[PDB]
Amino acid sequence: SHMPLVALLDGRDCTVEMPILKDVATVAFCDAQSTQEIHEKVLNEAVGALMYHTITLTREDLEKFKALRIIVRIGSGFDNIDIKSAGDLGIAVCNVPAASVEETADSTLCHILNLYRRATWLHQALREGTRVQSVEQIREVASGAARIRGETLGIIGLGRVGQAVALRAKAFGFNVLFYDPYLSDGVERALGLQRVSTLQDLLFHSDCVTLHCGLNEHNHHLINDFTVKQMRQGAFLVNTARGGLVDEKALAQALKEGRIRGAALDVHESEPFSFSQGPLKDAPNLICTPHAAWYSEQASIEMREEAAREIRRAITGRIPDSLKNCVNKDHLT
Amino acid sequence: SHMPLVALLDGRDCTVEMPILKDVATVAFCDAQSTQEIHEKVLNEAVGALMYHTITLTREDLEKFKALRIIVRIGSGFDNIDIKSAGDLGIAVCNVPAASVEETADSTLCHILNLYRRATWLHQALREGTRVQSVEQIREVASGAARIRGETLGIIGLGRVGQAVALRAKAFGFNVLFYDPYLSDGVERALGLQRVSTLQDLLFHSDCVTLHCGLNEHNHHLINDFTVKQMRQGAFLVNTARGGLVDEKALAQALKEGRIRGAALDVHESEPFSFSQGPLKDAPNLICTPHAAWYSEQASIEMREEAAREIRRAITGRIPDSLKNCVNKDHLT
Amino acid sequence: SHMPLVALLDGRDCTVEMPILKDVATVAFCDAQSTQEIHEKVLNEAVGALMYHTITLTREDLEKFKALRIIVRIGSGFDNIDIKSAGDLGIAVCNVPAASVEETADSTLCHILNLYRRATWLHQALREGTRVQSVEQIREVASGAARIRGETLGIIGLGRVGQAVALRAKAFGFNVLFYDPYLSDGVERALGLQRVSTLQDLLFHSDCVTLHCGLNEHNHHLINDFTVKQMRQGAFLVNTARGGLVDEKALAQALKEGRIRGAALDVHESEPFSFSQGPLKDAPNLICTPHAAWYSEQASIEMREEAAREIRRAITGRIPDSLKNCVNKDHLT
Amino acid sequence: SHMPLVALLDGRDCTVEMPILKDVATVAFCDAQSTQEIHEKVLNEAVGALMYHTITLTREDLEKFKALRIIVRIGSGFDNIDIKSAGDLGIAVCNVPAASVEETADSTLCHILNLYRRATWLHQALREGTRVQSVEQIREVASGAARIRGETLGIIGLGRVGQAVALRAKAFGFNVLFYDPYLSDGVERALGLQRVSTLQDLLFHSDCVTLHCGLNEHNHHLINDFTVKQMRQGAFLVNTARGGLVDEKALAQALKEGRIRGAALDVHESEPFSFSQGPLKDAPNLICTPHAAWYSEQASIEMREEAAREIRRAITGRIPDSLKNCVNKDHLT
Ligand SMILES: NC(=O)C1=CN([C@@H]2O[C@H](COP(=O)(O)OP(=O)(O)OC[C@H]3O[C@@H](n4cnc5c(N)ncnc54)[C@H](O)[C@@H]3O)[C@@H](O)[C@H]2O)C=CC1
Ligand SMILES: NC(=O)C1=CN([C@@H]2O[C@H](COP(=O)(O)OP(=O)(O)OC[C@H]3O[C@@H](n4cnc5c(N)ncnc54)[C@H](O)[C@@H]3O)[C@@H](O)[C@H]2O)C=CC1
Ligand SMILES: NC(=O)C1=CN([C@@H]2O[C@H](COP(=O)(O)OP(=O)(O)OC[C@H]3O[C@@H](n4cnc5c(N)ncnc54)[C@H](O)[C@@H]3O)[C@@H](O)[C@H]2O)C=CC1
Ligand SMILES: NC(=O)C1=CN([C@@H]2O[C@H](COP(=O)(O)OP(=O)(O)OC[C@H]3O[C@@H](n4cnc5c(N)ncnc54)[C@H](O)[C@@H]3O)[C@@H](O)[C@H]2O)C=CC1
Ligand SMILES: [Ca+2]
Ligand SMILES: [Ca+2]
Ligand SMILES: [Ca+2]
Ligand SMILES: [Ca+2]
């Protein structure tokens, strides 16, 4: 009569997952921002866990769980989970890789176009009461807006989102380069893109750089005071991937000195983001969104139902065979 | 030793046009917003005129000119000039149709994506100090953001910009319809688009309506209290064409009642636009830009040099034969 | 009780048109290749005519009709009808411009790919018993086959078919140029194509030239011994437009001397075409189809029903107001 | 003073590879179709081997080599090499995956269009002396030609070539499905394609099926008398992948009975192919090419130089670390 316990760590709404898990698991929520906010009953008894990106799990946090057997990220990125240590401790880790691919690529194009066309900043200026009566004033208030055709878009990481962004960028006349040191040669040919070997070549040729790679152990602060100086003078930066990829200290100074003309960020080193705190406090030409590139109503529901199904499959079947999107089979023992 | 006079009516900067017209015409500027601000010497002697969109010329204004022989719009739209009366009075009228086609389509896609992805509004909320720490809060602050694939984009006017917008929209998964009662049948087939016969059919099937037609004598307030009720509940409206095409009274009420979920406007019935005056004072979910969809540095220079060349051709050669973009040959006599 | 007479001049099958015209017109067929094969009753009484491309109507032929009031081409091209003289004689002339736009563009791409990839010729060689056992033999038998990406496709005439061909060619990595002296500037920008001013520039830069213009009074033998020498050495020629556009004498010699590497022709100066007669008797590297680029079952039915509707509209209503695709309103009096 | 020996097994031309390998290896050729035609000196001393697709290497053949340390396929497919046994015997096996991706996709589109548009068959009929004078005769001779827009293209294997084919097919109005049981979910979203789970679903919904998968131990005769009956009545089949994927016995009967309207094959169960021998002797509506989809001059040179570089890297450096495209690291010991 006793069912396994499944806990939603960093959230409270479990409505979407309930119809899928009802006869399979007891569902609880912790609304927790850190391991320190999880009830002892969860740490002791929880067999499965559902979590988003707002809580981090180190080996230290993972060891506090005594019965945990699977974690499912309701989302694609899993940089916030110590994946190797989880596998060592016998804990499967899964993600939901496909629900928000095109939502995120559309948000990226929106940010790219917002930098080239300055629509967001032009809207601000009108809210700020700027009067734009003459053509000379239009040119002034829209100064910096640029023609897109012929510009070079450099994509770092050509996966699901990177490929979706590349196909969209081609429609606006962008010349699309990409740097992805983990793909085998020939993907540039299938999609009709130009590829480059080193990050430096990408940054050297790109008028606008957009990040679409996972945050892993080898690319923290991939954009830093060193690689920032490799970018074109007056280039754009876009990041809907992970804030850990950008040294905001170096970015702030680049915006202030004009080396980088503008930047659009949906993710940040420390989230939630605030224009009043952080290295970007006073950085100019800065567009930011609160980690919402992923969100649509259909994407939210899609990933939550898929996450719930993965939980069911883990409880009902055999780990890790029954799992569709386990990302640490190599480490599981 | 005496050269013809050419006047820049609603502007002062003539730097781009000077090298082209130096040995051909004396160049003056009026920096005028209305006919009432033009020096008598210009009205009497001016043989050619260069103007943008910030001044209107009625038959009354046109009759005040005694020597005028050609007007050149530095831009594509010429709804601000009485074209038939100008032809009656023997005044050629030309435009520059191609300089900003893709700048304007890129601005349109930026506004479309800004409505579907709410990037602009999400940026505002962060400037307003909203804290978005949890996923529930992300869903809340980004409420309304929608998946684009499967959505129907309805294009009113499938000319230079409309076609550029259609090709771009297809890359995001839009289903593209268009209504253009002046094209012959078969253009929908060449570009792989679906066409509809009546404005009502366009509005009935479209999740997002975007205007790309000229403002002519038959489509003032094309969007009005009658046709607004023909649009889908919760649809988007985009207008980078002409503000005269939209009854802002009807639009404001539709935004307030939620019939229209959001609207992005680069043009307005009365320009310059102000969020503090007009029928849109208090309208919600409203994005606006100060008639800047056209602007890039390369587009501004391109159209100004082309405009200057048209002036040269008029003075040097025969009107209207030597003109490349005269838009009123039928009326000229 | 007496209905108007409508005659299918160069055909016999009227099944598709009958349900549309039953209560409107008496339908007869002539199965005629020339005016000399039309029954006197048709010449005297026929009020409307339906015809394809296999019969020509000069002023001489048109004058033999005494009651004719409208001709409808079941197809887009109407170069086989003296359009000006028909208008002089009070005879409306209409076409069906849209039924086969994409069928014809698909046939064109098939011919283009058949030249670059030599699939057709490679199939012939296998029917001829050629044994291709080694790689050296594959290279030999497929000699001439070329990589498409980077190649320049030059389009002459950027209308319905030309635009459909341009969009398809871009997907294969072609660089697309076009020459069309009748379009206003700005269409190259909407579709993201490069335009050229003179036929010579088109031929000078193109690795493969494809014809998509109407045959009019100013472009007979557009490709001739003079303009053929303006083409790139070893270029391809494709013609699914009209055979009258190409001087086959000049073409034959160019194929024989290797100046042109290969040619694909769906239309010819004299049709039907035969590899045993004509200036192309012995021309090498020649692919030909019997004027079938237009044909699909859905296209044949679509244009025949549309043609029948145009006939109905002419009889039932007022000429030329009620006509949707009259191509000689300027001449009708 | 003694260099390693490198042998071109199934070819004689080594000109492209010589400048790259001169100071690294002694180069010989065998022009051999089977292991039985290789000189004893090669079998004993050869340290490296270059081969195409015209010779097969079983464990039996591999064991005859005494010094062989690396095999390099000048091409992407390596189904003709026992890869597991080669790794067991300590023999690295590499391929060249990218040189002909777009050549092969262009050949595939040529075959697809040749079936839908019947250009090849229409050319044959003209060579056979068929006279096509009337429209009724055009419809007759081109019977079977079909409109492409709305048709469903089913891709089996969505790798380098499959993706290139998908993007091209979208430009013609195809609805593109694909079946690839080895990809993780989310690739359909990045490229805007519809995916299906089982081969049966692919065949059930597709008007035209095209094969783009490797020939492996689990898909020999993937198209067989069982799966052929799962295809749509009157569907098309295209195969530029591997002939071993199709049971030609089942295919022949399907063409004869009309279940399959037509088939285009660049590869065959037994190559070289002959219309006079094999299960396809008398099959109708059959287009064939002699395994030439890969060939362009630039592709041939590109893959041969890359192959030579891989050989150099193997001799000069450490196996398998220094290899860029080793396809059997898992088996090498
Ligand atoms: N802001 C948001 O709400 C969302 C953020 N994302 C983020 O966007 C990123 C991309 O997501 P997907 O495309 O689904 O991931 P994916 O796994 O499909 O693709 C990631 C690609 O990045 C490449 N990569 C890894 N390290 C790299 C490096 N140092 N340099 C260049 N390339 C590298 C990999 O080879 C891989 O191809 C992820 O980090 C994910 O967290 C994704 C969706 C929504
Ligand atoms: N905000 C800005 O800075 C810019 C605004 N524009 C405006 O955008 C509009 C489109 O410009 P282009 O594409 O260059 O014009 P265009 O002349 O190339 O195309 C206009 C099309 O609209 C169609 N049309 C006219 N009346 C219509 C109606 N009642 N319903 C449906 N279709 C109708 C015409 O048939 C024509 O095909 C113009 O009004 C122009 O003023 C253009 C560029 C920049
Ligand atoms: N083989 C077949 O069964 C078929 C043949 N066709 C032919 O293909 C041709 C194109 O058809 P559509 O695209 O429907 O015609 P369209 O009227 O849509 O376009 C024709 C274009 O050619 C341009 N043009 C005219 N003379 C020119 C010259 N000297 N140089 C460059 N451009 C020139 C015009 O400006 C126009 O834009 C027609 O001649 C038609 O007869 C069309 C369909 C099927
Ligand atoms: N005729 C010619 O000259 C040429 C032939 N080819 C052939 O075309 C085929 C594709 O080549 P690439 O795209 O470079 O290979 P690739 O390795 O890039 O892609 C192969 C794809 O097929 C999939 N696949 C494997 N077995 C499958 C099955 N049973 N059902 C569905 N999908 C399956 C794999 O998941 C993989 O994604 C190869 O077999 C190759 O030999 C390639 C180039 C030229
Ligand atoms: Ca720049
Ligand atoms: Ca909606
Ligand atoms: Ca060449
Ligand atoms: Ca069918």
Outline:
Chains A, B, C, D: Belongs to the D-isomer specific 2-hydroxyacid dehydrogenase family. Chain A has two domains: 1-100 and 295-333, 3-Layer(aba) Sandwich (Rossmann fold); 101-294, Rossmann fold (3-Layer(aba) Sandwich), CATH 3.40.50.720. Chain A is 33% helix and 15% strand.
How would you describe the overall organization of this protein?
The structure is a homotetramer of 333-residue chains. Chain A has 333 residues and is an alpha/beta fold. Chain A has 13 helices and twelve strands. Chain A folds into two domains: 1-100 and 295-333, Rossmann fold; 101-294, Rossmann fold. Chain A has helices at residues 18-21, 40-45, 59-63, 83-88, 101-117, 119-127, 135-141, 160-171, 187-190, 199-205, 225-228, 248-257, 297-316, and strands at 5-8, 26-29, 46-51, 70-73, 92-94, 152-156, 175-179, 194-195, 208-211, 235-239, 260-265, 286-288. Chain A has a seven-stranded parallel β-sheet, sandwiched between helices. In chain A, strands 2-1-3-4-5 form a five-stranded parallel β-sheet. In chain A, strand 3 (46-51), helix 3 and strand 4 (70-73) form a beta-alpha-beta unit. Chains A and B meet through helix 5, helix 6, helix 7, helix 8 and helix 13 of A and helix 5, helix 6, helix 7, helix 8 and helix 13 of B.
